[PDB]
Design a protein around this ligand. Sequence first.
Ligand SMILES: CCCS(=O)(=O)Nc1ccc(F)c(C(=O)c2c[nH]c3ncc(Cl)cc23)c1F
Length: 258
Amino acid sequence: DDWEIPDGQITVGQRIGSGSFGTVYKGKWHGDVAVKMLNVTAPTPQQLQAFKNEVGVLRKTRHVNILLFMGYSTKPQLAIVTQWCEGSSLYHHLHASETKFEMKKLIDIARQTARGMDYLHAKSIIHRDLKSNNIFLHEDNTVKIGDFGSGSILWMAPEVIRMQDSNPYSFQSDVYAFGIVLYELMTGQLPYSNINNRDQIIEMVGRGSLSPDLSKVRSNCPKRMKRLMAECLKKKRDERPSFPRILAEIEELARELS
Ligand SMILES: CCCS(=O)(=O)Nc1ccc(F)c(C(=O)c2c[nH]c3ncc(Cl)cc23)c1F
């Protein structure tokens, strides 16, 4: 009904990391949790509404691939509480571990990711900033999608880079985001890897003249999964697939099997 954790109950220990959002610690509260304490000292009364309006959105997410919102503090600092996750994120795995993932295991991670996303949309939540860094792999099996509610241009649809008019952030923008995750998964690689220049990419992808190189997909990706990708990466936004049918193709190609 109300989800506030009164001062005292969370035992904050260890500083894991941060962001423009906030700073994230591990912690004890009826078991393990994570606490993202916002960059804010004195809560201005209109700021206690910014938060509780952002919280009312967070508590409309129940689902196994949507990070588990659990509670919000007020009294030591504005903060969001959630499940503690185990292991490391999709990014860490696809880049600075060198973990071989089999085609089987990679498709599943894509399946579980678009499971998160279709749910959020069914709920009318534009994520806005999906990427492999904000997909935490709990136990190295279960996708948990978080950090919803410059920054990272690599997952940014051309219309976002540039800017539509009345939108541009929308269900579709979330969809190009999802393709770039597909590229990462199905090439094990960040795109524009050879062209390492933020300005170049911002200017060249928004103008419609640089798009991911699909020849770097591992020779053993299915051709269903490869065509699915290039649909999502469409520069024209409304030619893009929306999420029901994205979640169809993936589960429905997943058989095959091993
Ligand atoms: C349910 C959506 C809440 S969120 O959008 O604000 N995302 C969010 C909120 C609070 C958090 F602490 C975190 C977060 O980064 C982690 C949540 N669980 C984790 N487990 C391990 C690590 Cl390393 C980080 C986290 C996080 F991703």
